[PDB]
């Protein structure tokens, strides 16, 4: 046995089709004997739901497109008594309930759930992943894991924004984070956090190739963006450098009882930051260590860029990361553009 | 008119005293004509509540000690119709309600509220402050503000932890963040975020003196800690450096639609980080710019430490921040301790 709960959003749009997934889960879940409740209010869904067969149903539920923005808040494992024995799937429409003594519970539910969804926008992806897995993210114990650490950072951001109005800097930073986050997430990396004009993320050791392709993809999308936009647009001089390193880091909850953060700690972090900063003076936009090189299996053309200090380490790149430009020239071009 | 809502925790412990704040707010709120609802479930409180007189009541409510961990989720301003006209304060104990059709709404409420409180532990203090003020923190528009930027950072953290087990590094980092956060918050600064072994925070320009005292207090609490603990404890070699700068920075929501962060962007950020890093080579543990100096009104003994590069800027400190040690000696002492 096991119980699990999630909340959801509006994806599409009808008085009826509730009854579809009602009728269906009603007859479906009795062939498979699961019990649960569907509640709906002001365009939010809430659902409660053996141990194996309830996952054939969940794997259907997320891939179900009648709702988007699915977060499994809770999961209980090997339970003893079901919460809703006789209900194969009871659907409750709390917009239709106007009883005077249910409005309070109805209004709080509305208010705390909407607040909760605003807070999810500030959460580390690793905390949201924990939560979805039914793990309490505040009591996980920190573990030493192996990671490829990723750092990407805007070239001459001070100069590029030093003359822009507030809203235009924010638009530019957001676009940059938006393009980085999407490609990282598509290749199976997790963003760890944002630092100024800078994206920090990690990949596993089975994902080296995916870490170079991310890097290359990001470089590629910005070169497209720069000629997609007009020359008076700030996006026209948006460049990045990218640093990658490999190593054992600590992943866990860190901080006082007041504020918690869930992050990665280790020297690899520092090394990726510096290889990133080191691209500025390289004829390449991507720089990485030998450890990253050995996580790769594709026939990259690896170029050895010598040993550098942070005990100096070998640095490498791929031919595909050669810059079509000269990094000093780009930044005076950046200073000339806004006088 | 205005309505406001909050949630709360257990502070102390009785079947009766509900009726106290029941009876009291019942007669109290009718002298002042406010309407609202108190709900209680599994040790959580929820309350809904003219425009002026409801703040005499809130200012009582937080200072009321029967509950801790108060967060004002919502606030509506100049409303037209009250939600609960005839209820001066209706108290609803949802632990006593066993109706079969209320258990769902009861279980969800429980589940989403508990999740919500776990997420608050990951929120930036500035987002929580916005929320408490009734401002939607995801639509605030970014503003240029003036800030003293604070950076504090552990001396030789790599060396100090390079031989420790995972749990001991986390204990040490947590203690360090815990001591920093408490003193910063006591002096009216907000932590902005944690970066590795490093605390980032800000103060206003009216709070320079408070920024030096924080810095000095932190240095002081760690020197106490080091001789409070045994010499085999890692806390015995915990030191910090602190950098302060002043400047216009952008404060706002930054990122893609996936992840949002609420933070400060500007060159002052970079300058505080470097003055911090610069203490490592100084005979002082605190370093700051002229801009910080002019935010101070107390008769500090300001020591001019010359001009330094990051166009080189003047750097200053206070006599009270002189180190009783030599920064090279401390780190070999740190390497000798764990062989
Ligand atoms: N932890 C942080 N939080 C917020 N902003 C930061 C942080 N660290 C740096 N910044 C800011 O990010 C901006 C960019 O700094 P950065 O060091 O990337 O210089 P740059 O102008 O982009 O030159 P480069 O080509 O070396 O990147 C600066 O305004 C800096 O203060
Ligand atoms: N953005 C980050 N996120 C997580 N960890 C980080 C970050 N930046 C640095 N670190 C890690 O923090 C640790 C301390 O690095 P730091 O640069 O403070 O060196 P240190 O050993 O403390 O020497 P110093 O006396 O110069 O501080 C390193 O393991 C580093 O990789
Ligand atoms: Mg940059
Ligand atoms: Mg940067
Ligand atoms: Mg340090
Ligand atoms: Mg550091």
Coordinates of C-alpha atoms and ligand atoms in Angstrom, one line a residue, chain A residues 151 192-193 195 200 263-271 273-274, chain B residues 153-161 194-198 276-277 280 327 331, ligand 2:
Chain A
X151 CA 29.5 28.1 -14.5
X192 CA 22.1 25.2 -8.6
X193 CA 21.6 29.0 -8.3
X195 CA 25.0 34.7 -8.9
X200 CA 25.7 27.8 -11.7
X263 CA 23.4 23.6 -2.6
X264 CA 26.7 22.1 -3.5
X265 CA 30.0 22.7 -1.6
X266 CA 33.5 21.7 -2.7
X267 CA 36.6 22.9 -4.5
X268 CA 35.3 21.8 -7.9
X269 CA 33.0 24.7 -7.5
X270 CA 35.8 27.2 -7.3
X271 CA 37.6 25.5 -10.2
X273 CA 34.2 29.5 -11.7
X274 CA 37.9 30.2 -12.6
Chain B
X153 CA 33.8 34.5 4.2
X154 CA 35.6 31.8 6.0
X155 CA 39.5 31.9 6.1
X156 CA 41.0 28.8 4.4
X157 CA 37.7 26.9 4.3
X158 CA 39.2 24.3 1.8
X159 CA 42.1 23.6 4.1
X160 CA 40.0 23.6 7.3
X161 CA 37.5 21.1 5.9
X194 CA 24.8 32.1 0.9
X195 CA 27.7 31.4 -1.5
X196 CA 29.8 28.5 -0.4
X197 CA 31.5 29.5 2.9
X198 CA 30.2 33.0 2.4
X276 CA 36.5 40.8 1.9
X277 CA 39.1 38.7 -0.1
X280 CA 43.3 37.9 3.9
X327 CA 47.0 35.2 8.4
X331 CA 46.5 28.7 7.8
Ligands
LIG2 N1 29.0 29.7 -5.7 C1 29.5 28.7 -4.8 N2 28.7 27.7 -4.4 C2 29.1 26.7 -3.6 N3 30.4 26.6 -3.2 C3 31.3 27.6 -3.5 C4 30.9 28.7 -4.4 N4 32.0 29.5 -4.6 C5 33.0 28.9 -3.9 N5 32.6 27.8 -3.3 C6 33.3 26.9 -2.5 O1 33.6 27.5 -1.2 C7 34.8 26.9 -0.7 C8 35.7 28.0 -0.1 O2 36.3 28.8 -1.2 P1 37.1 30.1 -0.9 O3 37.3 30.8 -2.2 O4 36.5 30.9 0.2 O5 38.5 29.5 -0.4 P2 39.1 29.3 1.1 O6 39.6 27.9 1.2 O7 38.1 29.7 2.1 O8 40.3 30.4 1.1 P3 40.1 32.0 1.5 O9 40.8 32.2 2.8 O10 40.6 32.7 0.2 O11 38.6 32.1 1.6 C9 35.5 26.1 -1.8 O12 35.3 24.7 -1.6 C10 34.7 26.7 -3.1 O13 34.6 25.9 -4.2

